[PDB]
Every structure is written in C-alpha cells, then in structure tokens.
Amino acid sequence: GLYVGGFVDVVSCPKLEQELYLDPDQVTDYLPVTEPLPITIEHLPETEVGWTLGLFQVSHGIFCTGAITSPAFLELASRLADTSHVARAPVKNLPKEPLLEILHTWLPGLSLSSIHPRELSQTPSGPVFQHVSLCALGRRRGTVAVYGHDAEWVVSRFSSVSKSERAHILQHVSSCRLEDLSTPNFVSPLE
Numbered sequence: 001g002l003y004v005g006g007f008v009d010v011v012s013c014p015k016l017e018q019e020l021y022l023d024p025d026q027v028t029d030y031l032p033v034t035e036p037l038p039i040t041i042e043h044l045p046e047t048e049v050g051w052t053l054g055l056f057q058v059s060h061g062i063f064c065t066g067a068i069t070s071p072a073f074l075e076l077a078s079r080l081a082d083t084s085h086v087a088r089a090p091v092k093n094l095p096k097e098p099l100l101e102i103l104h105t106w107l108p109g110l111s112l113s114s115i116h117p118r119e120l121s122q123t124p125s126g127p128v129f130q131h132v133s134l135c136a137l138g139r140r141r142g143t144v145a146v147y148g149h150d151a152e153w154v155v156s157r158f159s160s161v162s163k164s165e166r167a168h169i170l171q172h173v174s175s176c177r178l179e180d181l182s183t184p185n186f187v188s189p190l191e
C-alpha cells in the first residue's frame with residue numbers, strides 16, 4: 001500500500017454545469033474529516049483505489065492524506081511503472097521509484113467533492129463530502145500530489161505545511177487501522 005498527500009481543489013461535481021470550484025472557506029466549518037472517504041479516479045464511483053486518512057484545514061489550504069490500498073490498482077500500476085514505455089514517457093529518465101514518479105505525474109491533482117454551497121449555509125442534513133479523487137485534468141490551485149511508502153515522508157515533502165501541522169496530520173494517520181478498511185472496488189480495465 002502507498003500513501004498519498006496533497007492540497008485539494010474543492011469541487012461540487014455539478015450535473016448541469018461543467019464544474020464549480022468552491023472557495024475553501026465555504027467548507028472549513030465541516031473540517032476536519034476524520035472518517036474514511038472513498039478515493040476514486042476522476043470522480044468515477046466504480047474506480048475506488050483507497051480511502052482518505054484525514055482532511056485538515058492548515059494555513060495554506062485543505063490538506064488530504066490517503067491510503068492507496070486496492071490490490072488490482074497497485075499491482076497494475078506497479079507493473080506499468082516497470083514495463084510501460086507510455087507510462088514512463090512523461091517522467092524523468094530512470095527514476096529510483098518509478099511507481100511513485102508515475103502516479104505523481106499522471107495523477108497530480110487531488111479534488112474533494114462537496115455538496116453544493118447553497119446547502120453549505122447551512123445545517124446540512126447528511127454528509128458534506130462524498131469522496132476524494134485523483135485527477136489528471138481540472139487542477140486550479142498550486143501544488144501537486146505526492147505518493148510514497150511512508151506517510152511522514154509524504155507530508156514532509158510539503159514545505160508549506162509546518163512541523164506542528166504535520167504532527168497533527170500524522171497523529172490522525174497513525175490512529176487509522178488500515179487493515180479494517182474494506183477493499184476498494186477498482187477493477188483492472190484490462191479485465
């Protein structure tokens with residue numbers, strides 16, 4: 001299993017409009033998120049690859065850490081990172097950690113899916129957030145996602161996240177029993 005970490009765009013995934021990007025201040029009252037949310041690809045519910053391990057308001061935005069736990073996803077991505085010329089083409093030559101480099105460049109955006117802001121003000125009936133997605137398109141804010149084998153290393157890549165903020169994030173990550181999370185539903189698109 002891998003960890004992912006990054007700042008999210010906050011998005012409502014509207015049916016009619018093409019996209020709505022929320023100001024983070026519109027949702028910070030519902031933070032932190034300390035229960036697992038599905039992590040999917042490009043907001044597709046049949047592409048669960050793992051589970052969030054916390055969403056926290058820090059000084060420079062809303063930071064998410066997550067676990068990529070899907071066996072079919074990790075095995076496929078790991079095989080492509082070692083053998084696929086296409087996957088490696090946008091990456092620097094001969095990376096020490098090809099799987100981490102490939103995810104970093106192909107899935108650089110984290111997006112947090114929220115209810116519409118009209119609901120956000122206020123007293124929503126049920127959960128404010130539906131999922132976090134790894135995205136290839138549609139990034140607005142700065143910073144990109146970091147993938148790694150150890151959460152502390154992932155979070156400490158972000159120079160804009162302070163030592164106190166990182167310790168707070170890492171406390172929540174450590175309190176999560178990875179074994180207890182159900183298997184995400186990702187299926188290998190080759191099957």
Ligand SMILES: COc1ccc(Nc2cc(C(=O)O)ccc2NC(=O)c2cccc(CC3CCCCC3)n2)cc1
Pocket residue numbers: 041073076077080087102103106107136189
């Ligand atoms: C782990 O490997 C994969 C391979 C393909 C998919 N999805 C997919 C599906 C189907 C299908 O259904 O027909 C067709 C195309 C697919 N994927 C893309 O066009 C694409 C574009 C940008 C980023 C990614 C994420 C992936 C890229 C490779 C490194 C691991 C991360 N995928 C998802 C995961």
Ligand SMILES: COc1ccc(Nc2cc(C(=O)O)ccc2NC(=O)c2cccc(CC3CCCCC3)n2)cc1
Pocket residue numbers: 080084085086087106189190
């Ligand atoms: C839906 O069916 C498929 C077919 C092939 C793959 N991927 C794959 C496989 C194998 C294999 O097996 O050895 C080797 C390389 C593969 N693909 C990638 O490394 C890669 C990386 C980034 C994005 C994509 C999307 C890809 C899908 C549509 C054509 C254009 C670009 N693919 C993924 C899904």
